[PDB]
Amino acid sequence: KVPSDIEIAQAAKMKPVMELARGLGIQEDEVELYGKYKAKISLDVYRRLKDKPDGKLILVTAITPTPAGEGKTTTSVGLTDALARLGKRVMVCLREPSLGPSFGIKGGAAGGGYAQVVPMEDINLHFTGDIHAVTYAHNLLAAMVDNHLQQGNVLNIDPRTITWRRVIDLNDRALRNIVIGLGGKANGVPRETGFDISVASEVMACLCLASDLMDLKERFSRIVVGYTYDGKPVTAGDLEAQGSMALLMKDAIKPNLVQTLENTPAFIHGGPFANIAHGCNSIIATKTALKLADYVVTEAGFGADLGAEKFYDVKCRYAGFKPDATVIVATVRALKMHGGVPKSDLATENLEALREGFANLEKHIENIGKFGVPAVVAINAFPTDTEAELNLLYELCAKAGAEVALSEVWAKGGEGGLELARKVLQTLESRPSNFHVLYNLDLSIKDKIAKIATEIYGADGVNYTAEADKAIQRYESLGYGNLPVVMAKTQYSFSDDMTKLGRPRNFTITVREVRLSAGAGFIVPITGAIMTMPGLPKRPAACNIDIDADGVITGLF
Amino acid sequence: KVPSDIEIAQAAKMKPVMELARGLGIQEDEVELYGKYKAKISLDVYRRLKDKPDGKLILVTAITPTPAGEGKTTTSVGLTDALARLGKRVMVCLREPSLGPSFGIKGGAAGGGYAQVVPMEDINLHFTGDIHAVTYAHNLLAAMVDNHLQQGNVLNIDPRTITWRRVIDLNDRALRNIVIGLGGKANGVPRETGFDISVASEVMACLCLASDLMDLKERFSRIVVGYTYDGKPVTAGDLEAQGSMALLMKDAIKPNLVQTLENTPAFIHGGPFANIAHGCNSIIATKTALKLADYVVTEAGFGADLGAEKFYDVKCRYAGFKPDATVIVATVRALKMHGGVPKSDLATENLEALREGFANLEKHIENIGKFGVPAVVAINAFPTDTEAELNLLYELCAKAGAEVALSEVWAKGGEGGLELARKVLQTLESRPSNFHVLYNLDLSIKDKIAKIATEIYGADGVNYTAEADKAIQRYESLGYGNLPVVMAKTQYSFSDDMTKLGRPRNFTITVREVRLSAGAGFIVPITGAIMTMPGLPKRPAACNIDIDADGVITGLF
Ligand SMILES: Nc1nc(=O)c2nc(CNc3ccc(C(=O)N[C@@H](CCC(=O)O)C(=O)O)cc3)cnc2[nH]1
Secondary structure: OOOOOOHHHHHOOOOOHHHHHHOOOOOHHHOOEEOOOOEEOOOHHHHHOOOOOOOEEEEEEEOOOOOOOOOOOHHHHOOHHHHHHOOOOEEEEEOOOOOHHHOOOOOOOEEEOOEEEEOHHHHHOOOOOHHHHHHHHHHHHHHHHHHHHHOOOOOOEOHHHOOOOEEEOOOOHHHOOEEEOOOOHHHOOOEEEOEEEHHHOHHHHHHHHOOOHHHHHHHHHHOEEEEEOOOOEEEOHHHOOHHHHHHHOOOOOOOEEEEEOOOOEEEEOOOOOOOOOOOEOOHHHHHHHHHHOOEEEEEEOOOOOOHHHHHHHHHHHHHOOOOOEEEEEEOHHHHHHHOOOOHHHOOOOOOOHHHHHOHHHHHHHHHHHOOOOOEEEEEEOOOOOOHHHHHHHHHHHHOOOOOOOEEOHHHHHHHOOHHHHHHHHHHHHHOOOOOOOOOOOOOOHHHHHHHHHHHHHOOOOEEEOHHHHHHHHHHHHHOHHHOOEOOEOOOOOOOOOOOOOOOOOOOOEEEOEEEEEOOOOEEEEEOOOOOOOOOOOOOOHHHOOEEOOOOOEEOOO | OOOOHHHHHHHOOOOOHHHHHHHOOOOHHHEEEEOOOOEEEOHHHHHHHOOOOOOEEEEEEEOOOOOOOOOHHHHHHHHHHHHHHOOOOEEEEEOOOOOHHHHOOOOOOOEEOOEEEEOHHHHHOOOOOHHHHHHHHHHHHHHHHHHHHHOOOOOOEOHHHOOOOEEEOOOOHHHOOEEEOOOOOOOOOOEEEOEEEHHHOHHHHHHHHOOOHHHHHHHHOOOEEEEEOOOOEEEHHHHOOHHHHHHHOOOOOOOEEEEEOOOOEEEEOOOOOOOOOOOEOOHHHHHHHHHHOOEEEEEEOOOHHHHHHHHHHHHHHHHOOOOOEEEEEEOHHHHHHHOOOOHHHOOOOOHHHHHHHHHHHHHHHHHHHOOOOOEEEEEEOOOOOOHHHHHHHHHHHHHOOOEEEEEOHHHHHHHHHHHHHHHHHHHHHHOOOOOOOOOOOOOOHHHHHHHHHHHHOOOOOEEEOHHHHHHHHHHHHOOOOOOOEOOEOOOOOOOOOOOOOOOOOOOOEEEOEEEEEOOOOEEEEEOOOOOOOOOOOOOOHHHOOEEOOOOOEEOOO
16 A cells, blocks of 8 residues: 555544543543643642652664654654553653644654654644744743833843844744834834744743743743843843743643554653754653653654753753663664765665765764763664665674664554564663763863763864854853853754764864853854744745645645 | 632632533534633534524623723623523623733733633633634735745735735734845845734634635635735735635634633634724624524624624624624713713712713714614613712613613622613513614725714714825725725724714814725725734833742732
8 A cells, every 4th residue: 555644644543632641640630631632731740749760761862864864753653652562651752843844845744654643733733832832932022122122221231232032933034134123212122133933942942941830930030131231131030021921831831642643642842943952852741751651752853963962961961860771763775875875876775885874873872872871773664775784784783882673663653663662671671871961060161062072073173263252251251151052053964064974083163153041041052054944945835735625634744 | 899800710610611512502522622611612513503593692882982991891791691690591702802911901801800701811811722823824924925025026026015914912012113034135035014913913803704714714815915016916815825824723713612700601712903803703603602592692892883883884794693682881980081071080970971971872872773773771880970870871871762771790790780681681572673784885985984984973074195095996996895894993982083082073084094904805994093013011011920839820910
């Protein structure tokens, strides 16, 4: 046959999230329905199971992204199916996808094939309106700033230094750079600013790293909006915003229980950028998944260079977390591109090029080892991947020195990854973890980037532009020196040079600019231009998206 | 004596809505819950009951609003409640408040005192996401207009003629006048535009006028966004955005079931502006209520010169409704302001200013007669009103030919509205209505404006600026002249001059500008400057707002 990811999403039987919440010991009144098959879970399921056994934590990451695509979520879902098939109490924790791209290049399944989270349609759109709550908390702050300038600028802000932008969850490039506040004294103060996609919001970040609402509230209050003419940081604190922002977020703070194509209890909650932030789902979803399972499968954005590292250094750091196993996804087609084979050429097998690419994966694996974490490997399998190829790889992974398996979940459900399932258990009974943070918050900023760039990206050194040192000297000086560091750089290389594939060496990194996220609580060094507002294409999906008399949706997927 | 509004809402015991729904004959499968105390309800309910007769339709409206306040919704809910107490099968239909006011001026009850729909907190905030859906349906068209220009401008829009703005549901004045698409050839096409509050979006209007999702989609396709360099109109249809917008509104098209304090079912659905739109809740909600119930209370925005007028001449026109009674809500105080007494001396008895002001009420009563609907007056009782005052007000209402009933629903819930309920029932059993709209569509725009102006406002004639003349000329030759006309003017006067209280004589209306909503399907003459995006005050309510660890919300109401 020939089924597509939408049909496999419709066709499937979903169980009322209510009775899955019972199949997890969640009380009737800790749920909060959204139709029969979506629901939010209250902040008491943690608060009451406050001390209970935290089950085991299984971060899935990937090798360096490629035009091939690797499907890091699928393999992360169809593994959760396996663990449950082998009758284990296992939850997946995923990220809420942005609305905007469903109308740009099309929406895609949570995971894929036969390793999906459902109902897919809802997840891609409004879902439980989590993003909307972010949007409005960001935008009210924005409004509150501009209003304050209107009301006489009591705090004496220079409007030209305001760093607080606006958000919306569409790909709209016409809003990147705009002028607001025009039309004279009645209509505000003229200034330059713009919009970023809502999922790039510091508020989106805070959500994903607040422990509870009261934590979220205060983080907000810390957020910088800009400076006074005198140069003194002004905060959301200084504008008494944080109350009203936490209120707008009252329900967004509750993680959303949904399910697998095979009824495995899933959370979906948060979803920030993996570059200017850390690309994990929220702390709240996983720490609730902890007290509720013995086995929590999760994930982080982009390659293991960025997602993993930040998962470990910022997520786990802040959350006292202690990740046990870790998967790393890889395709062979992917590693052949890392071996310098263009995409029209992966149609054939290149066994020589696959020995080349591997250096990527191995670099990753060594990095995992570096946190005191039991690395383990896994292969997404495809129609074209010959057994000569698969084996070549197979054998170079123990020749590297950590477990390996094969998954077929795209096509075989939580069976293809049954093999990989045992490995992790194998790895959890036999292989403890010895988890430390790859750096320490007491070092000054340059050392923190250094120890990151050096050991993980495998660079010899790091450089700074004029305004990179100017910014950093300004920060250490304002006191924000002791923060973690989130590395805004390209995903497709270890280096900032996006064309440098495989495992490049002898290069160095260059920090062009440095930004602050006081509310999220980290420093963001930038190496490229960052696209914080993608744009629609020449022939977008919004043009052919239709819904007819019956609710039948053509074009969306 | 009475508790404040907010606390009354919390301590109310609400019934599971699914219960209310099965009580009314809605099947469980036509219900999508949002907690225990909210639900979206299927457009299928209406579809299977299309043939059943309608219950009675009872419109609530009021006299010319003043600073002194009249409390129209208070009456609507309390009227609903009394009807329920008298054993009648009744629902009330109300509009969803805009989120933004909750942070500038303060959120307020849906009603007030003991006459309220609940859960209060939700209905002010995100409720069920209806406005968010409106926000993104709207802004997707914005982004598609902008993408089209960016991608080679095939339709040949003159970007400077674009009328389709952007929307957001906060009071942000700085967003009134903006320039977008800056930064260079890669960032879109530079142009002047702005934001209006979401609830003033034409898409909000359409929702409220649509008969279903397919009618809604077809309307969307008729939205005019701007013109070509040739002066030909360009529509959303031409941009092929309708399916998408229609998709964003798939859940939004369903009315929301909620309840009054005393558990009377209530729809809350849509909620447009009442000056540039018709200030009514969705046809969809109201049409469903008539099938489910024997009596349906609904209300309209602003005074009877505006809401009532548009309710009949637009809402009922499209829906083929024939209202059976209309209740005008008035207070001793507002009448005295209209009779001349300043806000601070409204407490001092003054039968003469009360007789003078009564003219305002007399003129409204009279108007409602021009639509063939029998009128009952509700007097919102107030503690400083003397017996002499109230008595005079009764004599005057009877002299003027309408039943009158004192209402203390605010104070005493459904019990304070029992005489009023009885008067309405009395009017319904003995004075059946003879509904007809004030005007035929085949008149000219200028004919239609003058008939409203003179019949309802008691205007002498109508003036038009040169700019308004060309608009009307343009619109008529574009074939939009047989549309309804929707006056945007001040609500604080029958005249276009908000300083003219009571019943002004020898005045003219000046139509300065004329705009079009071809989606909603009407023409919008504007008289004063119309504020489609209000600003925050000196201190915004947001500066006091907080929620603590318990979740105790202070500063909000
Ligand atoms: N905002 C607000 N709205 C209200 O309606 C309101 N009402 C009260 C208390 N309500 C009232 C209402 C009417 C009379 C009153 O006029 N009493 C006459 C009735 C006359 C008649 O039946 O004709 C009496 O005889 O006591 C007293 C208290 C207090 N605060 C309020 N606040």
